[PDB]
Symmetry: D2
């Protein structure tokens, strides 16, 4: 096929599939609303978010941190968000005791695969969590499809939902 | 009277917000189909550069560091499987990233790399970078202002910008491998 | 224009001679490094966290602190509560009151360990705060600090030497060899 | 029996500086072979070559040091030297065929590998053994022309600084026509 013919077809099809799957969140049955609410409550209570992601999702870890605390905060609060992947306490279990000792009120927010047992053990602990996983670990998580070709878009969409929900409660547009 | 806004219950609000969010995505989903050409040729030029042995020096504005990360990790994934190892460089992190004296950066870049092309995404946040992106060096510029005629023009305050970045990347990588794997001819 | 090989022999001889000459500098150091080290060790023993920062030229030394305090293989060592403050979202670019409040709410018991120049006012304000600190500075800010000379050609070695003193002191008390 | 901290630290400090003094002439005693290696590295830079710098896990700080010292935040009148963090490169070898070497050779006009410390995977080992020019600071003599560091030397960290300071002075002494090579 000629490049220019091919690309026209590819682009048309790409947009049509986005459109087709664009209502997926209306059908999503994992408890994302309740999890978002619980995470917002944690933030309001002065809690910290310790954010981690699988190897393929480091870009999305970066996205969370930069969006939650943008370079120019303007009127925004400085939110208690920590890059857990980059932490000396990331488990490769001394990690849990050190975490509990150093942070007043942490909650783990993890996205994607759980790539080692140390992390699994930490996430299975009693400390609160906001888990976006490819399979349920224990307790309601936000469930994603690992080989979904639209996964990357869905991650952005869920983040944008979370940030809107969070600031809607701040700024008193919405009550939990 | 008109009435001061009351306030909505979270669980009522979120259902409406979710519905509207997806529907706005659907409304806008055909945007690229409506774009009046030009971008295909720019993608083709970038692919030819890779085909010819060229390197991609990738930079992004402060808000798009995540997208710089995404480009690098998608083009050269952890498990290459059967893929080539593509010549892709994080230019943001480079010692040659200009402060200013873009002339010094440019000269060092030109002697260091056999065949560089600058792929920049977003705002150009200093004069040194602007000078280089204006240079004779081949470029793949995704900008908010049309600083060259041949650039991909992004809409800066578009609430859907982040998705469009993913979409353009996914178009690019598919176009690149379609040609690398002899599925299509340019 | 000396020949390279002649030049390098002289340079090497002189380099080692100057190291030797200045090698007893710490015996003559009059800033309160012993007291500051003790107070930092007590903080660590009390479950305190160390939030470590450094000026632009000393990012390598920030890295050195983090990797030495918590090496890849801990073996029998504790996991120490050490944080890269330069890299954190709370590092004050502007403004310091927001960062301080967020730090105080986030960490149970932080202590700031800063090395080198204080390159913005937000950091200065934080280091001026009530929060405990271990300050290795080119001029005294506040309370007793460990004083360094900015343009000392041997500065980089002295930084290593002070770290090595700190880590030996710390583990000496942890492994009950020494009592505070 | 336990020692008092303030007594202990005074002794420790004294002995620390004196050991540094005792060992301070180490480089003067070395067979001068390192001089030729430094010269070769300088000639590479003079000739328009790039330095692709890597380090073992324990020496990441020293990789940082090399990069920030060779190209400081304020260059003043200095040239912008062709120096690359190879650890951070997408071409850093893992598995993974020898895709890395071919991509490196096509990407860079004239690379030299400057590696410091342990060689922590076979892929890196393979490249550092390649025909590509190198400046290797190693714990075992994996080629005859390398700088040999003493691995469990308690003064290793100082010697790394000292060797770097030697290198940068040698490099600019030649760049600035203070010495002939
Ligand atoms: Ca619908
Ligand atoms: Ca145009
Ligand atoms: Ca072809
Ligand atoms: Ca030899
Ligand atoms: Ca000359």
């Amino acid at each position: 096929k000629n490049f220019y013919d091919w690309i026209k077809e590819f682009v048309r099809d790409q947009g049509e599939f986005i459109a087709q799957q664009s209502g997926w969140l209306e059908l999503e049955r994992s408890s994302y609303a309740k999890l978002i609410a619980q995470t917002i409550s944690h933030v309001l209570n002065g809690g910290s978010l310790l954010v981690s992601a699988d190897s393929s999702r480091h870009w999305f870890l970066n996205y969370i941190l930069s969006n939650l605390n943008p370079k120019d905060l303007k009127e925004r609060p400085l939110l208690s968000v920590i890059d857990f992947n980059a932490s000396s306490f990331y488990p490769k279990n001394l990690s849990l005791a050190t975490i509990e000792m150093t942070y007043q009120n942490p909650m783990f927010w993890h996205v994607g695969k759980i790539e080692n047992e140390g992390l699994k053990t930490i996430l299975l602990s009693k400390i609160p969590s906001f888990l976006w996983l490819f399979e349920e670990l224990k307790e309601d998580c936000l469930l994603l499809k690992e080989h979904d070709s639209l996964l990357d878009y869905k991650l952005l969409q869920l983040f944008k939902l979370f940030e809107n929900a969070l600031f809607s409660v701040l700024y008193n547009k919405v009550t939990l």
